[PDB]
């Protein structure tokens, strides 16, 4: 890796992809979700940003090459905090519902969600000096985030194998999702190790996009 | 830890959120027994009622008598409520219980007035709670009256004190005849 | 530790043993001398410490100042910094008093 | 060349939001973990709610109402937003319609979905609950009337604190230039906030502002973090006075002016002429956001 | 097009709220924590139902009543005969059924739910107070005529405290239907608001208005710290009010009107203030805040 | 309808009464405390009974007598609490809250609905010092007779207090049936006003009033400061002063009528100059209640 | 503080003053003595008890006394300290508060 | 209040004038040698002190006896006897508290 930058943050949710009528959330956020922030922070804009009925139609031929490796240093709880967000019906959408139709969300129906707590993230990127250059410049140029990338070393996370059962290990976790027809991401599981020690190279993961 | 709980039998659904609090900072966050509020707060609204019924099975003999300096300021405590609440009950009429137990016809009699001489003072502990005024309390649990380089834990904590003397003094509410 | 928890306890100490030993004209060698003058002298302390108990919960608050009964119990550079931190904030040294007595009144 | 965002706080006053998810006979507000206490909150939902429910009250022109219906819960009286002006103020335009207006076929506007302007945090309250409760009389509205009556009346019991609100605001960018009318309209709207919870009519809590403090140049936001303070204090004043002192050649406080309300009442002629002769006039919040809308129409 | 809201206190006496929620041996009054010390409560739904009372007592058209001769209390009037025509003070009534007077649609199109005119808020006091205060005494029983036969024969306590305390209020501003002698008598009312307590057997307190500020601007609260501890008689924001109208104009004293006590502490700057404009300060309170009522209605 | 409340206050003297009921060893006296001070003293209910005696000496009929003969206090009564063949003591039909039911509400159509028509409160000391003993004591018989008392002696003592104290009421009512020689009968008892804390054949302490007070008699409630003249000083002068002043020209003046002792010793040229009605100065109290009671009774 | 300890220092002031009157000013004979020590503090004890007990006699002539009685016996001095000589007037509590604490203070008694 | 400096101030020019009068050479002398201000403090001590006796003896002639004294002395009485009406109508507020306990007792 070329060098790291380290950020905190007091409220973050991450929902499941398609989790159901009642919300949940992951301890740590999805790669795809970093992927995309730093992207965005750096002052990319999206390559594809088509419109339709849904969006998100990436391929992956003109797109950066990069490799991502994910930490945490705090252990943070969670709560639910909601008790109502309409939705979209499926069935008759009888009577006004119809007769309305003026971009319709109609029809509100009470749900509840989490939140977490507090957030601490530790892990940068290793990528070519151009890339980190921008990204720079996006962030200085023409909550709070900066780079002590040698000090303040904490845990770290990495797939597992079928051995050395981990501990609060995530459940779930995504790569590289599009939200059309697909296979989605392959590996799901993900493991934590605590060791005040740089992460191996089994942290690191080249990502696709 | 969780095998222990099934032993004990009928109990409580007060001392039953033990099961709470089971959850390098909560590793040993169960020791510490912090469930004074919630299961307060609960208790409060209906079963303020209800506790003189059944006394739920003796509250699991009040969480089997706590299981049995900081355990020294645990255990003086449970002396000194005890200590109150007879002397108390002695000076109040000088009947003894040594004497009670003895002959038949008086058992119940005596025990009407532990239940109104312990409820009192249970409920004037149950409210009018801060981090000043508790501690004046303390009077009428040392009225009819080392050993004393501990208010540096006293006048710090104020949240732990205040729940061993709660639950302690529930100890010596009446055991049920049956 | 020279702090207010000891000096408390040791005045509380010596201010009801020093006024039996005027009153009543007592030593704690007799007391274990036989066990009849060890009863009454207990009995005697139990008189002496209860009235202060009654009493000192009598003049509550403010109205207590920092003078008490006997003139404050008839309490040497170490004085004069404790003497003004009791000055202000006077609430916390009464109650704690009320310890020191409680632990002077005779067991059983 | 940014959107300047600072942070509110309120006076102190009994708490009025109830926060449903009712158990047995009580009414309850959630609570956070922030250190292992207690602390009461508010979504932003409801203070976006409120903002607009204000823009349509100064008589901004809209096209969305939210009526007391007798059956359910509903908004209505909304036309196709086809122009970003006369529609929504620049903010919170969305549409998911899956077959509309030709899509910009006719409609020749753009999607106007996934756009926001000054997204806004959530509320956080100062002081840690303390385990209260109110007892309340609730008897049966009758026994003889026709309407009904529930069949007995019961006992219920709610709880109430006092406790101060702190909120950042989070705006951002240089795109909301097309109509600084709007945006000076906005702010003063944001000045005049009042009743912004939904909880109840009586024991009624309002947001004044007090003492907003919070200011940066076209850099992305740091140092302070809007959060992590105490109660009843300075927050406002020890945070960024230490930090200044500490960033006086660090960061400028010639843009970044004064913060606190007590320090306009003593200190100020020493803190101003350590600090810098800037624009940190200090003495209502109408007149300091007047100054803020007249630096930044320039901007 | 004008809105209004004013704190008002009043003179010091013993307490007269009293409900014995605790237990038949010892009667306690709700108590609330504030900086770490406690405070007595007065709530809101007294002072509604004895606006209701004085309502009534004024000769007005009501809508309510109660009976007093039913084993659990309940309300007759409310229910029974009206169909929620026309309130009190325009509160119509709610309440959700199957259905209520045929659906309240086809007989009297009228919403379910209601209009909630008023804006009241909970009362606090201004000292707290300390544990038990007085001793009471009970009898045997009647004896020969065994007719009521408690045997009780107990020594129970009562809890007593003397202080003085205050409450705010507000009013909506643009309602005007049928107003001009309905929200008059309502202020009339409230300018006594005698018969307010949780009992009436030996407190009898008075709830006679001592000193009020009852003005601003034409626009929504600028909530100028409503709850004010009048430093036991004083003001806390005189110096936030003598610039009556300046270069700077930093604070509004053109819409202000101050009650009696508060200009019976007769100073030198209350001969500067009565040059600056909006002074309105008039020693009879009463007089004083009919003449508000005739301002904001009349004028 | 003509409404009227009055203040009064005793002569100053040595006083104590039998308060605490709680231990043996020493007497407690003080109750409740002022502004961090403890000077109030006395029960509101006492007099009650104390009026309830004077009563039955003035040939009113005995309808609760207490009765001495058990070891614990028991009150007697007639047949049942009828409010119209007799005065009820007062019209003081209670509470009657039994299981047992069949009251006479089905068979002489009486709801046990109470006639209050009366307002007191506790009275209030003026002195603070409340440390003071007297050191009496008690003997051992040991007479060889057939009784023995404690057959022991004791040292014990009892506190005392040389106070004068005030006393407001209010009465608040109206004429009906067989009231008018009723209420006469209440006004003339309440002049002496003897036999207060039961017996004390040890300390001898009166009730008869000086500088007796009433306010407002014809008008409706708007009377304040009940508590006002205190420190053997006189309040109500400058009261008059600023409520309903004197002359009708800033402030109409209203009906007062004042008692004996401010105006036993007070500047003549005051008289002269408080004549703009005149209103009602006496020089012994008992002389102006049976004018009042003529007057606001109407007969 | 800076007049706590001026009360502490009329305090010594006025016990040497009064064993001045009654023997001898310096206090070396009474040095490794059984007896000579004995009388020392037996007549020092004797002293301040009966000094300290007509002070808290009068418990409730507060302001006067500490006028009239209570400051006259025991000698002051003043130096400079003239605008804190005024409480006096009108605190004539605490400042008796003090005395006695500075009296009970000076009792050598095991 | 003011009166309390007045009394106060007066008090060492009436002493400064008492030791002008009955000792010689006033303060010059005092650097030659201590031994003689020995004399001059301990005269100085016993001429107050004996006034100790009679200042305190009894109201009304302790009145009498300091009117004739104060008279002599001071040289700025004259200021003093024309303001706040003699003393505030001569005797008030027992002579200060007693000429404000002779000047702290000596000071």
């Not at chain 3, 020279?2 to 306890?9: D, T």
């Not at chain 4, 922030?34 to 204000?54: C, F, H, T, V």
């Amino acid at each position: 890796v070329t060098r790291y930058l380290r950020l905190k943050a007091p409220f973050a949710a991450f929902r499941p992809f398609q989790s159901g009528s009642f919300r949940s959330t992951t301890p740590v956020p999805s790669f795809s979700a970093v992927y995309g922030l730093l992207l965005n922070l750096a002052g990319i804009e999206q390559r594809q940003e088509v419109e339709g009925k849904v969006t998100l139609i990436k391929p992956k031929a003109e797109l950066p090459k990069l490799a991502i490796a994910i930490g945490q240093v705090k252990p943070s709880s969670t709560s639910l905090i909601n008790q109502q967000l309409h939705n979209y019906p499926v069935g008759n959408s009888g009577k006004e519902f119809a007769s309305r139709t003026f971009g319709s969300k109609y029809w509100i129906a009470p749900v509840r969600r989490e939140v977490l707590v507090n957030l601490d993230l530790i892990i940068g990127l290793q990528s070519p000096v151009e890339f980190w250059q921008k990204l720079d410049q996006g962030l200085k140029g023409e909550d709070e985030i900066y780079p002590i990338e040698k000090p303040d070393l904490a845990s770290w996370y990495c797939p597992l194998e079928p051995d050395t059962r981990p501990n609060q290990g995530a459940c779930r976790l995504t790569l590289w999702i599009d939200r059309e027809n697909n296979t989605q991401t392959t590996i799901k599981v993900f493991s934590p190790s605590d060791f005040r020690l740089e992460p191996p190279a089994k942290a690191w993961q080249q990502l696709p996009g | 830890d969780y095998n222990a709980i099934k032993n004990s039998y009928y109990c409580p659904w007060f001392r039953r959120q033990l099961l709470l609090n089971l959850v390098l900072a909560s590793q040993s966050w169960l020791k510490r027994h912090p469930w004074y509020g919630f299961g307060d707060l609960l208790s409060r609204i209906p079963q303020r009622w209800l506790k003189e019924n059944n006394s739920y099975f003796s509250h699991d003999a009040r969480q089997l008598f706590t299981q049995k300096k900081t355990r020294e300021y645990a255990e003086i405590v449970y002396k000194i409520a005890q200590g109150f609440v007879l002397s108390k009950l002695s000076s109040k009429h000088d009947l003894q219980w040594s004497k009670c137990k003895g002959n038949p016809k008086l058992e119940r009699e005596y025990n009407d007035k532990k239940e109104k001489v312990v409820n009192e003072a249970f409920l004037a502990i149950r409210s009018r709670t801060e981090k000043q005024a508790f501690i004046d309390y303390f009077v009428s649990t040392l009225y009819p009256h080392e050993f004393v380089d501990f208010a540096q834990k006293l006048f710090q904590d104020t949240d732990e004190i205040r729940s061993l003397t709660l639950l302690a003094l529930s100890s010596q509410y009446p055991i049920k005849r049956q | 530790t020279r702090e207010y928890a000891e000096i408390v306890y040791k005045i509380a100490q010596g201010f009801v043993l020093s006024k039996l030993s005027s009153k009543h004209d007592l030593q704690w060698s007799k007391c274990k001398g036989n066990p009849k003058l060890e009863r009454e002298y207990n009995d005697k302390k139990e008189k002496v410490v209860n009235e202060a108990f009654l009493a000192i919960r009598s003049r509550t608050e403010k109205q207590a100042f920092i003078d008490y009964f006997v003139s404050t119990l008839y309490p040497q550079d170490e004085f004069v910094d404790f003497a003004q931190k009791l000055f202000q904030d006077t609430d916390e040294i009464r109650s704690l008093t009320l310890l020191a007595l409680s632990s002077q009144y005779p067991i059983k | 060349n940014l959107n300047l965002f600072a942070t509110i706080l309120t006076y102190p006053a009994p708490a009025s939001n109830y926060r449903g998810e009712s158990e047995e006979n009580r009414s309850v507000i959630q609570k956070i973990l922030k250190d292992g206490q207690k602390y009461a909150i508010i979504s932003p939902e409801s203070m976006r709610n409120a903002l607009r429910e204000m823009l349509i009250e100064l008589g901004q022109p809209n096209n969305r109402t939210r009526l007391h219906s007798e059956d359910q819960l509903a908004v209505e009286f909304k036309e196709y937003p086809n122009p970003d002006k006369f529609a929504d103020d620049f903010l919170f335009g969305y549409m998911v319609a899956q077959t509309n207006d030709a899509k910009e076929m006719k409609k020749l506007n753009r999607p106007a979905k996934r756009d926001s302007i000054f997204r806004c945090n959530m509320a956080v309250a100062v002081n840690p609950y303390k385990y209260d409760t109110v007892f309340y009389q609730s008897p049966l509205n009758a026994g003889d009337s026709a309407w009904k009556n529930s069949t007995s009346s019961a006992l219920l019991h709610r709880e109430v604190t006092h406790t101060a609100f702190q909120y950042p605001f989070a705006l951002a960018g240089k795109d909301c230039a097309a109509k600084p009318e709007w945006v000076k309209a906005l702010l003063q709207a944001i000045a005049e906030l009042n009743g912004v919870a939904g909880g109840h009519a009586r024991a009624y809590y309002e947001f004044a502002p007090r003492s907003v403090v919070a200011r940066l140049t076209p850099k992305l936001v740091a140092g302070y973090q809007t959060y992590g303070f105490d109660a009843e204090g300075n927050w406002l004043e020890l945070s960024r006075l230490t930090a200044t002192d500490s960033d006086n050649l660090d960061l400028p406080a010639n843009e970044f002016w004064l913060g606190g309300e007590l320090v306009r009442k003593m200190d100020q002629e020493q803190k101003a002429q350590l600090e810098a002769m800037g624009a940190h006039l200090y003495a209502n919040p109408e007149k300091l956001f007047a100054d803020l809308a007249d630096s930044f129409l320039g901007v």
